Every structure is written in structure tokens, then in C-alpha cells.
Amino acid sequence: CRIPNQKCFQHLDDCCSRKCNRFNKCVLPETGGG
């Protein structure tokens, strides 16, 4: 899905995973990058 490696914010919904790290960046889910 839409690549989880972007910047994530509260009202910023882009990364399909919504998995964010300590740098407020999206990270890859266990599902992958579909």
C-alpha cells in the first residue's frame, strides 16, 4: 500500500500502516509494503 516511510502527523493520513516510530516517521509493518 502507500509506503510507510514518510512523515506521519495526527491529521496526516498517508501511510497505510500508520506505524510510526520515535522520529515520527512511518515504518514498515509486518504485512509489508502493499
How far does CA 13 lie from the centroid of its chain? 9
Q: Residue holding cell 493520513?
A: 13
Task: State the SS3 of the chain.
Answer: CCCCCCECECCECCCCCCCECCCCEECCCCCCCC
Give the integer Cα–Cα distance in Å for 11 and 16: 14
Experimental technique, in short, is: NMR
Give the whole-angstrom CA distance, residue 21 versus residue 1.
Answer: 18
Q: Which residues contact 4 (CB under 8 A, 6 or more apart)?
A: 15, 16, 17, 18, 19, 26, 27, 28, 29, 33
